[PDB]
Curated annotation (Swiss-Prot):
Keywords carried by this UniProt record: Signal, Transport
Protein name: Major cell-binding factor
One annotated Gene Ontology cellular component of this protein: cell surface
Gene encoding the protein: peb1A
NCBIfam families: PRK11917.1 (NF008885)
GO BP annotations listed: amino acid transport
Main localization, broad class: other
Functional summary from the UniProt entry: Common antigen and a major cell adherence molecule. Most probably involved, with PEB1C, in a binding-protein-dependent transport system for an amino acid. May be involved in binding to intestinal cells.
Entry's family note: Belongs to the bacterial solute-binding protein 3 family.
Subcellular location: Cell surface
Tree of life domain: Bacteria
Species assigned in the record: Campylobacter jejuni subsp. jejuni serotype O:2 (strain ATCC 700819 / NCTC 11168)
Length: 231
């Protein structure tokens, strides 16, 4: 299995985001995705193959990352993949390497000050993301009703926000920072913390152990990488 196939290919294939500043953001001038998560991926490649250059990055989103893991087209996913009990039944997750929290991105012209001002709001969320469940509960805890519109990817939610087809775009603040602009704002409110793990197909206990041990045993190096990226 899986460590052996990686050695045989001579390459670790990792699914990463391409739109998250400081974590994994495509630098279009160089055609390379750069950030903390990419640096963690390179450290894992170095651990397995002895060389951080022996890696291939595949851009994924919340919808596509699962299927690419399922069919073996990536070996691991390091792509803001929130650990949840439901997801742990489907995939293996390492212990967390970082944590963020869900936020709300809204047009400045709405003059929303907090979620409490958003009764009746249509909130745009991604298909396959944790967001709908978390914001629903946040809203219920302060006694307001909201509705949701689901989208296949993040650029489409931002376009919906700009067109006023939704009243807010909700997801991890890490991701919202990749979409905020002069006409919009991320509210100060923070919601359910999102703990991110390195995700592997449930195929292979040995590889899951390797990856979990990696996060634990390279914790200091990973934390230093977070600092280098401003995290
Ligand atoms: N972190 C969130 C959103 C995302 O990764 O796109 C999730 O795992 O659903
Ligand atoms: Zn920044
Ligand atoms: Zn090690």
């Amino acid at each position: 299995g899986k460590l052996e196939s990686i050695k045989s290919k001579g390459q670790l294939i990792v699914g990463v985001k391409n739109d998250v500043p400081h974590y994994a953001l495509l630098d279009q001038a160089t055609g390379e995705i750069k950030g903390f998560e990419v640096d963690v991926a390179k450290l894992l490649a170095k651990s397995i193959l002895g060389d951080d250059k022996k890696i291939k990055l595949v851009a994924v989103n919340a919808k596509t990352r699962g299927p690419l893991l399922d069919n073996g087209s990536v070996d691991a996913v390091i792509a803001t993949f929130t650990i949840t009990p439901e997801r742990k039944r489907i995939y293996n997750f390492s212990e967390p390497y970082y944590q963020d929290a869900i936020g709300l991105l809204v047009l400045k012209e709405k003059k929303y000050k907090s979620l409490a001002d958003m009764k009746g709001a249509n909130i745009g969320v991604a298909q396959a993301a944790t967001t709908k469940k978390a914001i629903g509960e946040a809203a219920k805890k302060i006694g307001i009703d909201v509705k949701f519109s689901e989208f296949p990817d993040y650029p489409s939610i931002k376009a919906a926000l700009d067109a006023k087809r939704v009243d807010a775009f909700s997801v991890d603040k890490s991701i919202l920072l990749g979409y905020v602009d002069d006409k919009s704002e991320i509210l100060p409110d923070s919601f359910e913390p999102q703990s991110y793990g390195i995700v592997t197909k449930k195929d292979d206990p040995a590889f899951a152990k390797y990856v979990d041990d990696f996060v634990k045993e390279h914790k200091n190096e990973i934390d230093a990488l977070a600092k280098k990226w401003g995290l």
